[PDB]
Design a binder for this molecule. Structure first.
Ligand code: 2DU
Ligand code: 2DU
Ligand code: 2DU
Lengths: 288, 272
């Protein structure tokens, strides 16, 4: 149990430290909230913090870890945006009491050994060309949940596939934590917040509005059915300069092995130059 | 809201994972230390030595989980002073079927993982589940299935689980035959030959003063003196089942087929 100073930012690197502090806090009555991040915080991460802060008597733990296990690919890992000085400044400004910034050796001292194997959802959509990506993410999430043992854990809905697989993890391994999904924070034109928006030049930043415009078009077109919703989104993506579409798909909300009913999720992934952007929205089909 | 009924000092049986989760949490909060003894199949004396080990921790409450007479076994647990039996159905354990699972590391592909290549995935996935449902302070396994025990310690380390893994020395028949549900099927000639497994290993552990080669050849000799004993492997490893270091502590493992039954044994070895 290292020093805990309430009402300021305590930073721990050692998993044993954050674990002992967390358990200490839980035993004295505070509910522990966890917000997993990979750093490069934007207003989207701040919204997760602010959701966690609203839980009465919460202490909020933000983890910052760029997880080598979920990455490809030669250069993807090294190219990840890292800005930890601006990261800790914002958390201090939001009143966060705990930041957990582990080293790679402390998370993976034996290298990759026991891992989480996701269900078949991890091979679809984002997982199609990146077969071990979601095993890497579910493995780090499980370890975070075990080190921190929060009551609730918060994720954005922007990476909706990820959030769904995380729900499966929690359910399938009987984890005793409530998973809270927070609606995607957007730029004023509709662009979903993402660490990788900084890679759009001014022309690409202009075209990028097409994704959220396509999804909202579809969500309104959907009174007329699935075909009309998809055709609306496709038309908007087509009218946009150098948007290259990787997929546009409408699925049940659990994304599972079941057909679409009245409520669905429309997901899109597109490339602007070298930058791959994702977005998604709730869709109600027909009568609703 | 309400915690399920629990009556201290008696045998309380729950089939619902949420029920045992709630009661275990209530128990931990009033002070007791929760010990978990997982079992499967009909109860044998190896499982009972796990219970007795668990029962000796002061302030413990002992949880025995059971995967498939059932009332005779429950009466044994009652006679051992166990206060909780967790007896879930497959549907309760897998309400969404097989979905997210544990993938063991490369150890699972060696030794027993050769004939049964996904067996350890199943075992680690169900132990992980049992651990999250019960959240024990200590969890108890026999040393008998030593490869399983090592895999579970890796699971606990790699997934940062809070629990102490306690391995309990293997209960043996009076001639040394390691306890196993399979022993009941051996005919007299197989039962007699099966002593060669433990006799080999203990000869090896004593030959070990003369070095690792002497220890291996002693075991191989004892195995070669038994008829009808088809040896699958005889392997000397370090205690974590990596390569045996030139001296220090180790484990010697054997598996063999006698007729239709596969038997396994292992033992601590100290080189030199
Ligand atoms: C509430 O509004 C939003 C909007 C977007 C968000 C978020 C919130 C959060 C993220 C984000 O990147 N989350 S994460 O993948 O880094 C969370 C995470 C961290 C570690 C393991 C698994 C998941 N992102 C997306 C992104 O930065 O690309
Ligand atoms: C339904 O869920 C629970 C959970 C824990 C419970 C009980 C019920 C009952 C007890 C218990 O100890 N009852 S007791 O009369 O033997 C002792 C006792 C009395 C008053 C305060 C604390 C413990 N205990 C604590 C125990 O068995 O050690
Ligand atoms: C202290 O001495 C012993 C001796 C032999 C033992 C045991 C203890 C325990 C077992 C045993 O059968 N363990 S188990 O397969 O029932 C444990 C288990 C339970 C549930 C899921 C996975 C593993 N066995 C037999 C065996 O491992 O095949």
């Amino acid at each position: 149990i290292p020093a805990f100073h309430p009402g300021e930012l305590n930073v721990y690197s050692a998993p044993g430290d954050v674990a002992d502090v967390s358990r200490a806090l839980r035993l004295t009555g505070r509910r522990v909230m966890l917000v997993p991040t990979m750093g490069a915080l934007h207003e989207g991460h701040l919204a997760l913090v602010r959701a966690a802060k609203r839980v009465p008597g919460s202490v909020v733990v933000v983890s910052i870890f760029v997880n080598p296990m979920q990455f490809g690919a030669g250069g993807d890992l090294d190219a990840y945006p890292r800005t930890p000085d601006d990261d800790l400044a914002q958390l201090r400004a939001e009143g966060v009491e705990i930041a957990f910034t582990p080293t790679t050796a402390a998370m993976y001292p034996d290298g990759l050994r026991t891992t989480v194997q996701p269900g078949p959802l991890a091979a679809e959509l984002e997982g199609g060309p990146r077969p071990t990506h979601f095993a890497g993410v579910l493995t780090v999430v499980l370890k975070l949940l075990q080190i921190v043992r929060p009551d609730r854990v918060f994720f954005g809905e922007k990476d909706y596939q990820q959030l769904v697989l995380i729900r499966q993890l929690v359910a399938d391994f009987n984890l005793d934590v409530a998973v809270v999904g927070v609606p995607t924070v957007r730029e004023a034109d509709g662009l979903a917040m993402s660490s990788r928006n900084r890679y759009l030049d001014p022309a690409q930043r202009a075209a990028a509005v097409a994704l959220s415009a396509a999804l909202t078009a579809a969500a309104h077109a959907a009174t007329a059915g699935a075909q009309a919703a998809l055709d609306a989104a496709r038309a908007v993506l087509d009218a946009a300069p150098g948007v290259a579409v990787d997929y546009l798909e409408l699925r049940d909300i659990g994304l599972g092995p079941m057909p679409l009913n009245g409520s669905g999720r429309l997901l899109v992934a597109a490339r602007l130059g070298t930058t791959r952007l994702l977005d998604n929205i709730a869709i109600e089909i027909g009568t609703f």
